[PDB]
Structure formats: structure tokens, C-alpha cells
Amino acid sequence: ASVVPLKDRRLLEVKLGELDFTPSGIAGAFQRGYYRYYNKYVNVKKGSVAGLSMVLAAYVVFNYCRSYKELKHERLRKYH
Amino acid sequence: MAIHNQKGQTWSLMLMSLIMFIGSTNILGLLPHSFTPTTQLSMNLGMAIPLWSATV
Amino acid sequence: DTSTWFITITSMIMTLFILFQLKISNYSYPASPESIELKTQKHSTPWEMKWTKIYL
Amino acid sequence: ETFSAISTIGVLVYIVKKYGASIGAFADKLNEQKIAQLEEVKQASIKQIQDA
Amino acid sequence: AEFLSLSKARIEAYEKELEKMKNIIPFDQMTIEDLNEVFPETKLDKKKY
Amino acid sequence: QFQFTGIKKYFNSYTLTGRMNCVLATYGGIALLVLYFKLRSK
């Protein structure tokens, strides 16, 4: 399973931003990564936001799971 | 690098690794529900003493 | 909070300083490159005098 | 109690403004370095071919 | 006889010195070791600055 | 095991003084004991 998780980061990193393979990241898949937010993080050209801001968005929702048991707070219903 | 200017410049290639670790692990934790290892007082007493007594 | 007992993190900090001394060790330096800028010239410069003595 | 979730995501939107100037800096960064490499490939040929 | 041939090797080594400079880079983004012939590297603690 | 010979020339250079975690180790062992001692007397 080690060659399974190692081929997740390697494949993802090349595809997400940058690597005949180095200039493939020069156009970048940042145009593919762009459409998720709205438009506004446009500065990803050489300081690439959507390359980095996906890992940090993954590390937040991964740490939302551990905190969920402690801060329950929910009634016998749903919120607004 | 500029201050030392000795044959104690060999030590300085480590000191820029020390700045990127607690430069990052203090900047990650500003996120919504993240956790910083330099919050706990345990490892910082293992960052001072093996470095400070490496000087004397 | 006032946490306790400390058997944790500090053994997981020195494994990290096998990582950071692996990445940052492979860093291209402009200054280092500059220091390889004059090594090619003056060997060929005296090589011009190597044919100046081979003739004269 | 996470209305401070938005304000740590709101400040990271204002830095995307200056990130469009960070690109120029990024583009500028190593231009000198690549040029720093163009000077050695240019000097070594021309200084030798006339000497021959 | 000798000085036209001792300059000829100095012409021949200078003809080999430029052709090895064309060997190093096939592209701007070419290589991190083929550029490690002209610009130098050394042993531990050489580059002071 | 090639996380060694890339940085093995570095180690025996500065671990002569840098690998003195014995003091750190000694402090850690003592710290664990005092915590246990206070929880023993509660």
C-alpha cells in the first residue's frame, strides 16, 4: 500500500500545477484548478494559489472530524 | 552568514532548516481547526537544550 | 491544556530533522554558481602561453 | 464559534491581490540566474575561438 | 614545423572546447548535471560566500 | 537506506557536539518520573 499512497502525491502534484514535461506546468493545470472558488484567486500564475490552497483546505476538513465529538451542541433538530 | 565569517560557517546550513520548520508550523495553525505542535511546551524544551548546549 | 507527562512529541521531532536536512540540502545557490564562473578562464589563458613557450 | 473562520479566509483573499504582483517577482526571479548562466556559455566560446 | 603544429593542437583543443559547450544544453530548461561541467562544484567548504 | 550516505559526511563532522541529547534524554526521564510521583500521591 506504500506504492499506492506514493503514487497519489506524485500524480497529483504534476497535474495540479507544475512538473517536455516542465513546460507542461508552464501553461499549468491552474486553469483547470481555477473554477472552484469563484474567479477571484487569479494570482496563481507564478505564485500558484490553487496548487497550495487545496492541501490546506484538505487539512482543515480532516481536522474537523476529530473536533466533532467534543463540540456536539446539536439539538433534536436541524439548524437554520 | 554575514555576521559569523569564520570556519563556524559550517553550522549555518542547519540554522536555515530551523527557521523553515517553526516558520511553517506556526503559520499552518491560523487555519479554522488546525493544530500546532509548537503550542505544547514539550518539544520546545527539546529544541532549546540540544541546541544551546551544542554551543557551550 | 496545562498538558502533562511529556513522553509524546519530542521523539517525533528528531525524525523531522532527517526530512528537513534532506530537502534543503539540495538547493542551488547563485553564489555557489558564481564561484564556478572563473575556474574555466585562466586554465585556457596559460594554455595560450603553453603554445607561446612551445614555439619560442 | 467560528466566525473567525471567515476572517482568516477573508485576509487570505487580499493577498491574492498582491499575488498578481508576486508573479512578476516570481517571473523576475531567476531571470538573472538563467542569464547568470547565459554569460558563461557566451564568454567561453568567443574567448577561445579567436585565440585559435 | 613544430610551431605550426603546436598551434594546431591549440586550435584543435579550442575546437573541442567549444563543441563540448554545445553538448551541455539542448534547451533552456535542460539539465542540472549537464550545466555542472562549465560552472563548477567542489568538495566540502569551498564556496566561502 | 539512502537517507544516510547523502548526509553521512555531515554527521561525524558536527554530531561530535550536536549529538549530545543525553542531557535532553536525562531531563525527559526525570520529568516523566515526577509526574508519576504526584499522581502516585494524587
TrEMBL record, chain D:
<comment type="subunit">
    <text>F-type ATPases have 2 components, CF(1) - the catalytic core - and CF(0) - the membrane proton channel. CF(1) and CF(0) have multiple subunits.</text>
</comment>
<comment type="function">
    <text>Subunit b, of the mitochondrial membrane ATP synthase complex (F(1)F(0) ATP synthase or Complex V) that produces ATP from ADP in the presence of a proton gradient across the membrane which is generated by electron transport complexes of the respiratory chain. ATP synthase complex consist of a soluble F(1) head domain - the catalytic core - and a membrane F(1) domain - the membrane proton channel. These two domains are linked by a central stalk rotating inside the F(1) region and a stationary peripheral stalk.</text>
</comment>
<comment type="similarity">
    <text>Belongs to the eukaryotic ATPase B chain family.</text>
</comment>
<comment type="subunit">
    <text>Component of the ATP synthase complex composed at least of ATP5F1A/subunit alpha, ATP5F1B/subunit beta, ATP5MC1/subunit c (homooctomer), MT-ATP6/subunit a, MT-ATP8/subunit 8, ATP5ME/subunit e, ATP5MF/subunit f, ATP5MG/subunit g, ATP5MK/subunit k, ATP5MJ/subunit j, ATP5F1C/subunit gamma, ATP5F1D/subunit delta, ATP5F1E/subunit epsilon, ATP5PF/subunit F6, ATP5PB/subunit b, ATP5PD/subunit d, ATP5PO/subunit OSCP.</text>
</comment>
<protein>
    <recommendedName>
        <fullName>ATP synthase subunit b</fullName>
    </recommendedName>
</protein>
From TrEMBL, chain E:
<protein>
    <submittedName>
        <fullName>ATP synthase peripheral stalk subunit d</fullName>
    </submittedName>
</protein>
<comment type="similarity">
    <text>Belongs to the ATPase d subunit family.</text>
</comment>
UniProtKB/TrEMBL annotation, chain F:
<keyword id="KW-0812">Transmembrane</keyword>
<dbReference type="GO" id="GO:0031966">
    <property type="term" value="C:mitochondrial membrane"/>
</dbReference>
<keyword id="KW-0472">Membrane</keyword>
<keyword id="KW-0496">Mitochondrion</keyword>
<dbReference type="GO" id="GO:0045259">
    <property type="term" value="C:proton-transporting ATP synthase complex"/>
</dbReference>
<keyword id="KW-1133">Transmembrane helix</keyword>
<protein>
    <submittedName>
        <fullName>ATP synthase membrane subunit k</fullName>
    </submittedName>
</protein>
